[model samples]
Target: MAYGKSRYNSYRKRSFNRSNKQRREYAQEMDRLEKAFENLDGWYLSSMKDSAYKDFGKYEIRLSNHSADNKYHDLENGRLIVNIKASKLNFVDIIENKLDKIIEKIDKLDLDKYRFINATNLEHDIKCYYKGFKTKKEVI
Candidate 1:
């Protein structure tokens, strides 16, 4: 079967409905990505193509180490960054009002329409939703 046009989309689900092994593989892929990201010497850069995927919804950054077939997943480090007029979704608003939105983004790797809700005023309890991301990445 042919994949849809979305198959090549930048922020698309690099994986979906993952099996137990695939989840572990994905985690390993990410760990490889992180080490490679911090140690990209000239020799390494000459061989592998490194790419970054920005999940505009929660600023999740997945760095794909192309030649190595690895991707490091991380929340954006607000290092040397200014707040934006457009990007404003919180991990909490996703739990409360945008459950479907969050799941589709993670499972489908479709991170479009990431900023449709206001996250600036959410309560503390709702902010705990990120635990699921860690759990899913680690256990599922």
Candidate 2:
């Protein structure tokens, strides 16, 4: 119970084992996280080789898997401007915020060695994606 060499060695060994176990469980949880959100209403998740697209509502959120993308240096080009599709623009920002939260959550799960993927090469997609959002204001 006192300051014995054997006890100290045992303590370090147990600590190391516990850490390893926790990491193993965390990795497993991360694996399940990919499809865990599907149960949530209106939350659609989809992905590709190294990228993915998750449209919670009107906002098509995009991010790279592994958080290793060098193309986001230009903020202007990265801005996603989605048009309003509904007759009344209600809760647009709220919907946009939901996807923002998803992005933040995905980033939070990143453990440097691995991460969940997001959408890339969305120029044409975003353009076509917004086209369906023709507004009454446009006609007026």
Candidate 3:
């Protein structure tokens, strides 16, 4: 008999179930990239390289680096790492091309004797995460 009771119940339910569509979308995008990276060959522990930008409207992954003692270096046990940086807006295509080029480059390397590295830029707005590898200074 009380119409107001139904209205109050609906309002209460709506408030309790509040969610941010934008945040959900952002999380979904990041999840998609993580899945894609996990399926990549010769890569593991694929994750965001920087915690500083965790709350920002952007996503980043570090594919590889060249410097001897940097974050992009291959694993000490002869494993390769990959990193990438991308904006939260329409980066799927950009990542695809970048991955294609890097994979091609990596395919040419000798994993036993070389480690991947990125010589172009190591920090912000990185365009090239996979340049080439340097000979291992010590046997791995």
Candidate 4:
């Protein structure tokens, strides 16, 4: 073998075991994944509202302040922007740091393996949009 069968043998064994376990233990695992996604949702919305974040769309989607009234909004127009209205930039820095951590954790999750990936995407999008949207105000 190129690397070594011995090393890959253990790796394969563990990967297979966990993958198969997930198949059978899905109900329990659902909670852990939920918590992880929820954490991301919280961070994403806050970071976005602070204007420290932007609409990444595919890998991520941001809920705009116009969410409830217009359903959603995007950065496609370029004119659409948010402001980090806090008194000091420190809060902006805080939101950014937290968001970076949340994004990292959320992306690390094996969400595609779940059956609800599509629905889950929508749910996360809306929740993030609405949660952050409340603080959004017009720039002018």
| Candidate number of the best TM-score | 3
Predict model 3's lDDT versus the native: 0.39
RMSD of each predicted structure: 18.3, 18.9, 17.6, 18.9
In order of TM-score, best first, we have: 3, 2, 4, 1
Give the per-residue lDDT digits (tens) of candidate 2, residues 1-140.
55565546554533343223466765664455454444445544445333333454424443333233332433332334222221111222333543554456436542122211222222212222223333311110
Report, for every candidate in turn, its global Cα lDDT versus the true structure. Answer: 0.33, 0.34, 0.39, 0.33
Candidate 3 residue runs with Cα over 4 Å from true position: 1-21, 46-61, 64-83, 88-92, 103-140
Please list the residue runs of candidate 4 whose C-alpha ends up more than 4 Å from where it truly belongs after superposition: 1-52, 59-88, 110-140
TM-score of 1: 0.19
RMSD versus native structure for model 1: 18.3
Off by over 4 Å in 2: 1-23, 50-53, 63-66, 70-140
After superposing candidate 1, which stretches have Cα over 4 Å from the reference? 1-21, 41-140
Q: What is the Å distance of residue 118 in model 4 from its true position?
A: 19
Clashes of each: 3, 3, 11, 1
lDDT of 4 by residue, 1-140 (tens): 66666566544433343233444455554444344435644333343342223344433323222112233345444222222222121333333543454356347652222221111121122112222344432111
lDDT digits (tens) for residues 98-129 of candidate 3? 55554464466432223333322222332322
Error of 2 at 16 (Å): 23
